[PDB]
Amino acid sequence: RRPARCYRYCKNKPYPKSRFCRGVPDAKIRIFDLGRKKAKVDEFPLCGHMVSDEYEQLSSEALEAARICANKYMVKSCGKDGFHIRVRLHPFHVIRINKMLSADRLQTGMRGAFGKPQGTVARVHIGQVIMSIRTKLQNKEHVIEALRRAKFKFPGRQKIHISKKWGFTKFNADEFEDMVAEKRLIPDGCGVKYIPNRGPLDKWRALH
Amino acid sequence: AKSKNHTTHNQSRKWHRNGIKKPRSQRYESLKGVDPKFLRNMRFAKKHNKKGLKKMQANNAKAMSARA
Amino acid sequence: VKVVKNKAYFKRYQVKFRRRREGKTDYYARKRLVIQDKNKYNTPKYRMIVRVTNRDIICQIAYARIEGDMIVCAAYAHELPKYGVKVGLTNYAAAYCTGLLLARRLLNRFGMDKIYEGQVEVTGDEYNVESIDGQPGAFTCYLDAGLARTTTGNKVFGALKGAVDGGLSIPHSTKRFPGYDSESKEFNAEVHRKHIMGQNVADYMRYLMEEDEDAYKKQFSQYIKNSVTPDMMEEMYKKAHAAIRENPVYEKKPKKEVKKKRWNRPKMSLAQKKDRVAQKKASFLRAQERAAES
Amino acid sequence: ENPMRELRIRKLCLNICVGESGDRLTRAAKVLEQLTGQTPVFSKARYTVRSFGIRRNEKIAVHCTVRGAKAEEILEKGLKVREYELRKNNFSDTGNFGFGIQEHIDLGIKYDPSIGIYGLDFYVVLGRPGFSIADKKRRTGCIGAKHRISKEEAMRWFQQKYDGIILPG
């Protein structure tokens, strides 16, 4: 296991798992929701999300260790089914290794210069959200402390932001309680459906 | 003994040392490369222009000199 | 619950063509029929479009431009009562007759009347129109049978034979006229003249008058209810071809105007559409207010 | 009160799928010739089974399409064999129904012992005047919504004509 001191900020084109690679091992992370997966929208009002600052690459093993630390702090703080954490970031960039000493100068040189797939990292833009935790109104500081414990573990500099939106949807929490009741937004599981006015009349007849 | 393989560095400057030239001068364009049926038209048309153009063009020149 | 029928199919649907979705063109034969070779730059390629429809057939000669197809001349089957042939408007005789009318009308429009008589006496041979030196040459035209399958006996070839006997130089073969035997390669001209004059359907009228008069009164009703007898048909088409070749001038109709119309239902405006929507909203609110209580 | 929108027999399919080629398939074609008076047409590959021994391009089946009064007569003989008792799932969603018979000499044909005991698939489609649009070469247009034949229309046709029983079980 080579350190993250050598696999670093983006210097090559994205090389994903596809028909052309066919040699990547399995990634470290497999799941992405840890809290109440079947949580309704009105259950957990607010959310805090972890904003990046450096154009870096985050590894899947770092994502594993960070989601384990955040899950452990959430189940110590607010217990089971009192939070919902989602890792927004998904690993697709496959790094390459050029290993040697398979201890003398007599194995190869720089003859075969193309490498073998070692692991999977994820390219992170500036301002891209790493993780997002939705909880109650009184659990404002616990989300901050959990994302701080993830901040001590991710490399580089990144900040925290408690969102103006209502959880994972793209709609504002200030207009949410006013606008889900009258006309438009209907709860669909953990997501929210937005109806336009460009529908057939049978949808409006089935509603109201 | 590995050497440098291929480059186009320091090439546009050598191109513009002497001022890359348009052909820039073709009056009465060349005629080779054109349809042989069209050439069987045009050569017979030119030699009968050389033969039978005298009297009608002469009377037309006299008529336009009289009318202008 | 089963199929994933239409999600982005409408968004990635490439429409074929207006006339192809109507089912009137193919364009794989039109790209070769229409387009003139570029050594001429202006010379129109004259095409005799022969379209067979129910109750009428159409025979035209047209060419093409980039704006649209310019029609040089046209002829229809429904004017044959005005040109002599009262009944039988979609037969092989009407095809030959419409081709002869179209050829005589085109040569009358071009003024090539006295020369290029063509074939006056209908014989059914392979009469090919030749060009006369010192005179304007023959009219070079090419066929358009359209989407119809060109089997031997199709009356698009009868319209072709009418155009050729009228004097339109169209290159053609004799192995698709009716009367050409499939096994024996020899062509029969007497059968083709018989099929121009329409004596086989005269034999079928004799067959109906001998076998079963019930079908003879069921079909062929306009024939027997004005007048049709086979000797008068054999004289009637022979008089009709001469009556067309003596007067192809196509006297038209005046058609000034009749300023009376209410047929097409016009569109409705944006405000009218939105107020239909608003009345539907108000009526459903009235339904939810009234019928849920009552 | 219905202008010329009448359900009628469009065609009638006759199919015999023999598990081998040669003698039995040729005698099945001879049976279809004894029914119709017209020659059948054979079938072929796009599958090789290997479980009972048929191969590519072998004459697996014979079939024949009958139209008109002969189709109505063979339909009458088939419903006389079944004694007018179909089931609910015979009628397709497009308004077409098949039933099939065993013991093909029940139609009224003198059996020869050299031929063999076969059976024959009967499949009926329904038609209205105006179904030549989708089959003609020039303007292949759509059928329509109010004109197409449905499940309920087909089963009410079979209730009205021939006095059949549905047997919805």
Add this chain to the structure above:
Amino acid sequence: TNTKGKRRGTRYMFSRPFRKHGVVPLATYMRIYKKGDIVDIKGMGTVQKGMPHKCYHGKTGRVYNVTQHAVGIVVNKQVKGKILAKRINVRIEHIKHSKSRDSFLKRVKENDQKKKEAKEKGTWVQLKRQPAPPREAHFVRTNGKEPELLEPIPYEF
């Protein structure tokens, strides 16, 4: 070492873009390609018989020879040495006109009409195409409403 064969970089360039796959239109054929006509080159994917080369795509040439169902165009191609006038045989489907020469002929016709009017009425016309002039000392209007004060907004994430 890039295997310099015919059309080794034409995954997109000789492709019909979107909602245009099918038969070719006939107005592409029904054009007037006479001699001396300044034309353009744009390769087609449907007709694989007369596409010029990947190097002549998007270029502009002059017609020297016209045949039955193609055309011959002279094109200035740049190579390592110097630009050269080269003789190409391209079919009709790959070629459209160039409207720049048509716009120049329209300008020449308008200048000839203005020169005829000048010779008629004795009026100088200034028919040269002057470029975009500097703005004259024009006059603004601020009646009714005061000029709206703009200030930069605070930073909110």
Add this chain to the structure above:
RNA sequence: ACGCAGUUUUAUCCGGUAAAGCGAAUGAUUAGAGGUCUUGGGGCCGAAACGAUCUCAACCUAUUCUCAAACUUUAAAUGGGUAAGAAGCCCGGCUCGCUGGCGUGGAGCCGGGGUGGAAUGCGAGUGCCUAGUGGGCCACUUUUGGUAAGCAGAACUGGC
């Protein structure tokens, strides 16, 4: 006046990178919801029974998370080609064995008419003979392999 430009302007085409998207095709990929066709595994009414019920598996519909140098609806900046006239525009007439309803079309030839036809800068075109050269390197920017290199290899420009 003739003409030219590592340049700009006015018109006219060309592309498929940066970006963006995949509730749009192809390839991947996360999670929840609704519906009930199908088969498989449990529990219930009880001889058994698609006679009936609950859950799960797969399927469909509307969503939702994250991407793709060898994906793309869209699509920049930069850039490439062309035209900016006396070699051009119009009129009249001959020739053609090319073409052909046509003195139709197209080419060539002959005679005549009017030059003030975007900016800026510069005096241009052409022929012969020939040395040296064919080991390169560095830097801003765009990038390939490598963990990285004063590493190896490319593009423009500048320098040694």
Add this chain to the structure above:
RNA sequence: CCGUGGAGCAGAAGGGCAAAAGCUCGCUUGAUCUUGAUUUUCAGUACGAAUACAGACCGUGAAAGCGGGGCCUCACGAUC
């Protein structure tokens, strides 16, 4: 019945193709002879490949036209 290419086009991929360049059927060798021009690599040399022509003899088609090998991108060779 739905079915815009999700199949097929000899084979590695890319482009392209629906009364089609895909499948089936009927005739046929234009996969023939000959002289120039052009593109590709390029030094504007050659080879291989290809294009538009021209002149004969032809094949198919009702004619239009199409065809001098494979729908295109390679599948091949100087002096003596």
Add this chain to the structure above:
RNA sequence: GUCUACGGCCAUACCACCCUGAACGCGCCCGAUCUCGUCUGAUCUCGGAAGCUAAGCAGGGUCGGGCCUGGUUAGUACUUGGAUGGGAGACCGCCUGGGAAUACCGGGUGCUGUAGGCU
């Protein structure tokens, strides 16, 4: 105000459903003796015209799906040229110029040439 035949633009003109069609025309329809090719006159051809606008077709409609166009996104992501600008790097800011797209919202849905016929 329309249709028929041939079209040019190639979804503003396709797909699903519901209404309307008076006059020509377009068609569904009625039958195989000749021309015709099929297992079947289902398809293609032969002489029709007893009914019909049920269907195609032509118009209108769907707070319709798609398509085109216009705001929003957005002077944002990008990008030519510059600095002895910042930062350890990652990258970021500025001067000079050019300037994109999805969600979101709003509007439309055929225009025409030739030839011919009906009000």
